[PDB]
Design a protein around this ligand. Structure first.
Ligand code: AMP
Ligand code: AMP
Lengths: 300, 298
């Protein structure tokens, strides 16, 4: 039930109408790994790259969740990926103010030999060409999950479609989905997107619920009524982490398991949004996670 | 991942303030219900009940995701029965009656699909039965066990056979002294550990617990103001919280065991609030987490 996580590792300058957090630890793989760690018994594997500015306090955070960082390269004198985002009163949508690929621009995604036998692969948000280069290095994956971002949907359409043709599960939010389909109807959008390759598609409408589209039909995961949203950053990636984490834990990829997996993902995302950055995970415990899952189950 | 054995029964419980007859009980029941609060996969149960063990009881276990395929049902038999009486100290008790019934000639059979269990809890029951079950587990990572004066006095030799093969042994202070023959709990711990158990936990009713290992003694203070109405099942719900937490995290280090002791104490403190295991009908995970935090701080 080994799990390998790929994605960005970065520092974010986050702004909402109520407050801000600069130089915040972030990146899609950070959120995915921290969330998934609540499901695996063995160390989560990470492949990525950071600069010399990536302090050891950040490495200690990951190691505290028993995350294996041997696959993370540190570029001497290089700079860590940076991102700036701004939210508004709807506390869901956001503007990307700045994006500096930095070390990820010239990244050579080498997956160490001891990671090539990974069974569950999560191709987190990052350049589709890198996502593909990593996938090509995994010998026999049981399940490939992937998510992207408007940046790549608009910047590298063709490359993205190449990766979409080789993934089992594609996770997107409703904005990205409509951008990819060119039609506002989510049902038609799902069809258009699934025809690009992904057998399973999950459309997460912010913290307003998630839709699971498979050959067996549609599953609507309810929203948590009074969720306290303070910072949406990382929500979609923590969702992906709980989703693949659950599947990696039970090792079964059936329909029923994917539905429960969506519920776990929603539960993890509901905790993520409670504070700036990934810090709600500092003290979040299993009893709390189990309790939140039950709420979502009951609502579904 | 977690397999539980022990008694399944109906208890006639009496205290100076009230009584509860034909109450669902048994060590297996208390351990399993408590442990379910910690595991995310069905707890496995091996045991036996009579034709008088109604659907309502199986439904209660099933409501907590407990797998009961390992429980046998004797169509012309009666479920294990016990009668106990508590006093004003609301801790010690007299066993007024014990009817092994179906557990008398019970040949424990662990179905094939339980054989790979990693965490095994040999709950209070005839030591001969506890051994027979353990002998059927392929390669367990941790074996926990508790007993009772009934067995300590009745089958000491058979019990000692079980103890030579368990990782963690859980007893209350009365059982501990009875086993050691000396009132000093520190000396008692050394004598009991010499019987085999590398880890010993002496739970003093609801007055705190002591964890003895090669690294020393850990004291889990008591919750000074807990509402005790029925102590029945306390020690077993303690064992359940203990092995349940470990089963879920998969780690059996000293550090996790001290935390597991705190979780067990939390579960026990809720169990005593009502007759039988019924406080668990409405108990939710956040209440448990809060109770745990209090024990942690103490
Ligand atoms: N182009 C990009 N590629 C990879 N990660 C990004 C990009 N832009 C922003 N991010 C990161 O993605 C995170 C938020 O993801 P999320 O809210 O789950 O969509 C932030 O912590 C950023 O570091
Ligand atoms: N000899 C025995 N073997 C197994 N279980 C017993 C025995 N005597 C009483 N019990 C059960 O153990 C429970 C209480 O355990 P406890 O207070 O945790 O020691 C009751 O619900 C009884 O059904």
């Amino acid at each position: 039930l080994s799990l390998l996580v790929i994605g960005s590792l970065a520092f974010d300058d986050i702004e909402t109408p109520f407050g801000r957090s600069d130089n915040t630890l972030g990146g899609s793989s950070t959120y995915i790994a921290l969330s998934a760690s609540y499901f695996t018994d063995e160390p989560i594997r990470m492949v990525g790259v950071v600069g010399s500015d990536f302090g050891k306090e950040h490495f200690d955070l990951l190691h505290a969740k028993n995350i294996d960082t041997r696959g993370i390269q540190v570029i001497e004198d290089g700079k860590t990926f940076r991102w700036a985002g701004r939210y508004h009163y709807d506390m869901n949508t956001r503007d990307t103010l700045d994006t500096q690929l930095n070390v990820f621009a010239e990244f050579d995604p080498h997956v160490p030999q001891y990671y090539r036998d990974s069974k569950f692969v999560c191709l987190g948000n990052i350049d589709p060409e890198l996502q593909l280069k990593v996938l090509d290095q995994i010998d026999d994956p049981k399940l490939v999950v992937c998510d992207t971002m408007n940046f790549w949907i608009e910047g590298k359409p063709e490359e993205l479609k190449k990766v979409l043709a080789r993934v089992d599960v594609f996770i997107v939010n409703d904005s990205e989905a409509r951008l990819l389909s060119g039609d506002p109807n989510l049902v038609k959008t799902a069809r258009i997107i699934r025809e690009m390759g992904p057998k399973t598609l999950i459309i997460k409408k912010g913290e307003h619920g998630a839709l699971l589209f498979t050959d067996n039909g549609i599953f609507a995961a309810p929203a948590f009524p009074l969720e306290s949203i303070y910072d949406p950053t990382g929500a979609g990636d923590t969702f992906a982490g709980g989703f693949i984490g659950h599947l990696a834990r039970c090792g079964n990829t059936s329909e029923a398991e994917m539905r429960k997996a969506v519920l776990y993902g929603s539960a993890m995302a509901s905790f993520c949004v409670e504070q700036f950055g990934p810090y709600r995970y500092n003290d979040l415990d299993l009893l709390e996670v189990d309790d939140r899952y039950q709420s979502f189950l009951e609502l579904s």
